[PDB]
Amino acid sequence: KTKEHLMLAALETFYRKGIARTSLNEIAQAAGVTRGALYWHFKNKEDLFDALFQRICDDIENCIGGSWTVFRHTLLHFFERLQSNDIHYKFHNILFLKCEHTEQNAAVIAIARKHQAIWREKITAVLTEAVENQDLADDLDKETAVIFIKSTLDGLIWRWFSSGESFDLGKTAPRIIGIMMDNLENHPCLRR
Amino acid sequence: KTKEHLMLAALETFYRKGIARTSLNEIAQAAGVTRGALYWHFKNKEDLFDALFQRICDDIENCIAGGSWTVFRHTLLHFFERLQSNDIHYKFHNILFLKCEHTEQNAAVIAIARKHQAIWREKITAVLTEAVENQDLADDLDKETAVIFIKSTLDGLIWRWFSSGESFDLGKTAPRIIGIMMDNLENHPCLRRK
Numbered sequence: 001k002t003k004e005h006l007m008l009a010a011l012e013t014f015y016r017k018g019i020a021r022t023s024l025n026e027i028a029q030a031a032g033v034t035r036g037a038l039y040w041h042f043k044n045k046e047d048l049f050d051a052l053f054q055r056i057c058d059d060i061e062n063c064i065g066g067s068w069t070v071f072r073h074t075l076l077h078f079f080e081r082l083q084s085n086d087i088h089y090k091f092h093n094i095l096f097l098k099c100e101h102t103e104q105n106a107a108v109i110a111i112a113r114k115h116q117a118i119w120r121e122k123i124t125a126v127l128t129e130a131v132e133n134q135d136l137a138d139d140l141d142k143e144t145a146v147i148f149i150k151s152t153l154d155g156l157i158w159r160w161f162s163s164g165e166s167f168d169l170g171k172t173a174p175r176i177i178g179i180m181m182d183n184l185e186n187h188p189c190l191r192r
Numbered sequence: 193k194t195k196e197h198l199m200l201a202a203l204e205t206f207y208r209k210g211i212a213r214t215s216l217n218e219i220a221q222a223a224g225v226t227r228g229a230l231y232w233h234f235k236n237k238e239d240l241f242d243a244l245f246q247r248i249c250d251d252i253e254n255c256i257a258g259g260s261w262t263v264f265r266h267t268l269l270h271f272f273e274r275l276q277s278n279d280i281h282y283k284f285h286n287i288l289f290l291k292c293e294h295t296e297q298n299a300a301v302i303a304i305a306r307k308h309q310a311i312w313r314e315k316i317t318a319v320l321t322e323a324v325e326n327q328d329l330a331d332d333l334d335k336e337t338a339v340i341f342i343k344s345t346l347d348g349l350i351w352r353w354f355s356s357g358e359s360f361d362l363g364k365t366a367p368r369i370i371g372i373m374m375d376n377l378e379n380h381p382c383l384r385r386k
């Protein structure tokens with residue numbers, strides 16, 4: 001029952017050509033099946049992409065003392081896996097570099113926005129649990145903190161991919177995370 | 193001259209269709225000129241892209257005017273203000289971050305973008321060196337890491353704003369981000385050489 005084989009074929013084709021220029025025919029041909037066999041498992045490009053997104057989010061929550069400490073470990077492990085896990089590597093490379101916000105990709109981009117709001121929620125919860133445990137201040141502007149966290153991580157990923165991986169992510173990621181963590185805990189500009 | 197018209201028509205077409213699906217024919221059509229009149233001024237899509245990037249880079253370098261590290265603060269704030277208020281800068285950076293897939297077809301356009309990145313990396317290194325000499329930044333500052341820190345911090349704000357459909361106020365967020373980032377460059381020990 002390996003609907004996993006069809007996902008990995010879409011991942012390879014999205015990786016090689018981008019999402020806009022990938023056709024269902026290509027994915028089926030790459031997965032070595034008929035259009036009909038592909039269709040029984042995934043109606044169209046969006047559901048392939050949604051399912052890869054789900055696989056990524058599931059790997060993250062699997063790998064999951066203290067809530068704020070766990071969060072630190074989650075961000076660190078994320079950038080490790082970006083380097084050592086080929087699916088995580090190729091998926092985020094697609095998300096940041098091969099997903100033009102065109103009207104051809106409108107439904108893929110709605111999918112991505114859907115997981116963005118899930119992730120915003122998981123962050124808002126971590127921030128609230130951290131306020132309660134006294135890791136963050138009570139006047140933490142949580143809404144700007146969520147933007148702050150997402151921008152920081154997005155910028156490192158975007159920088160690393162868009163530069164052709166020209167720097168050592170294993171050296172650089174802990175320092176970016178270390179700084180961002182310190183700012184959330186201490187910087188006045190992140191409060192109301 | 194007439195180069196200006198052709199360049200705006202390229203920018204609109206890149207913003208509508210992205211760089212990869214834009215044709216030189218369409219740009220000519222959009223601009224009201226024959227294919228041969230365009231080719232005279234711009235030999236290919238890459239030349240148009242390069243022209244637009246230079247004009248953006250020229251705009252920023254023009255708007256330069258206590259202490260040059262505090263000037264850096266200003267030009268950074270002016271960048272994010274221009275992004276929200278200037279149509280060419282908004283469209284151009286939208287195309288750069290959202291409509292420029294890294295396929296084999298765009299590789300020449302990406303090379304052009306990497307060339308302007310390197311110009312900007314050296315411009316950042318020079319601002320950091322002046323600020324060290326001035327002692328706005330510790331002489332101990334790790335300049336290589338700091339440049340990646342600066343680009344990654346700023347890139348992340350831009351990516352976040354464009355890819356989320358501009359669902360937050362850049363005018364209020366960007367000054368906070370810039371203030372934190374510059375605080376970290378002066379004070380955070382993670383940005384020193386040891």
Ligand SMILES: C[C@]12CC[C@H]3[C@@H](CCC4=CC(=O)CC[C@@]43C)[C@@H]1CC[C@@H]2O
Binds near residue numbers: 060074078122153154
């Ligand atoms: C930054 C990001 C959204 C937020 C994600 C992040 C990956 C790590 C992470 C895991 C969580 O448990 C909370 C959300 C975060 C913090 C994602 C990587 C790309 C995406 O834009």
Ligand SMILES: C[C@]12CC[C@H]3[C@@H](CCC4=CC(=O)CC[C@@]43C)[C@@H]1CC[C@@H]2O
Binds near residue numbers: 343346
């Ligand atoms: C971050 C960035 C490179 C560095 C640029 C930045 C725009 C603002 C800017 C102006 C300068 O004076 C130096 C370089 C910087 C700081 C660019 C926006 C996109 C690009 O990736």
